[PDB]
Amino acid sequence: KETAAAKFERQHMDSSTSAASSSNYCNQMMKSRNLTKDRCKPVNTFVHESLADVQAVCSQKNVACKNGQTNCYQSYSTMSITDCRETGSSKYPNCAYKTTQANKHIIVACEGNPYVPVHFDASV
Numbered sequence: 001k002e003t004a005a006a007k008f009e010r011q012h013m014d015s016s017t018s019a020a021s022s023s024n025y026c027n028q029m030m031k032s033r034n035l036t037k038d039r040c041k042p043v044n045t046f047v048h049e050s051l052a053d054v055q056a057v058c059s060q061k062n063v064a065c066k067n068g069q070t071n072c073y074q075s076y077s078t079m080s081i082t083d084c085r086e087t088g089s090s091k092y093p094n095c096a097y098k099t100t101q102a103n104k105h106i107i108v109a110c111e112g113n114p115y116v117p118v119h120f121d122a123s124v
């Protein structure tokens, strides 16, 4: 089985680009990261920062999670992110996405020893 930490890296980390590469970014990335395999995942965020910087967020500002748990943390600095959101023309297996670039604070849930990001909660 894929670990929850590995799943977070696959679904949410893209350190290779500093921002949204192009208008095609989300279509390519959602496919290549296996996020359109069983259905079109309707929304997903990629973070363009190093793994170390995103793992560091687990010792930053503790905030309530959307599900009511207390294991969420908000980055003190803004981070470069790309939001992918499913379009109207999008029909499985031909999933289609709009690509938005932003610089926002991220909120992740952390678990484990070592204590690492496992879920992306929100950006603010």
Ligand SMILES: Nc1ncnc2c1ncn2[C@@H]1O[C@H](COP(=O)(O)OP(=O)(O)OP(=O)(O)O)[C@@H](O)[C@H]1O
Residues within 6 Å of the ligand: 008, 011, 065, 067, 069, 070, 071, 072, 109, 110, 111, 118, 119, 120, 121
């Ligand atoms: N506070 C939390 N700590 C750990 N896991 C959480 C927390 N809040 C939500 N989750 C997990 O997030 C998931 C809900 O998101 P969903 O399954 O739609 O997307 P995903 O493919 O799991 O990727 P992501 O979790 O990053 O959104 C559930 O698996 C849930 O267990």
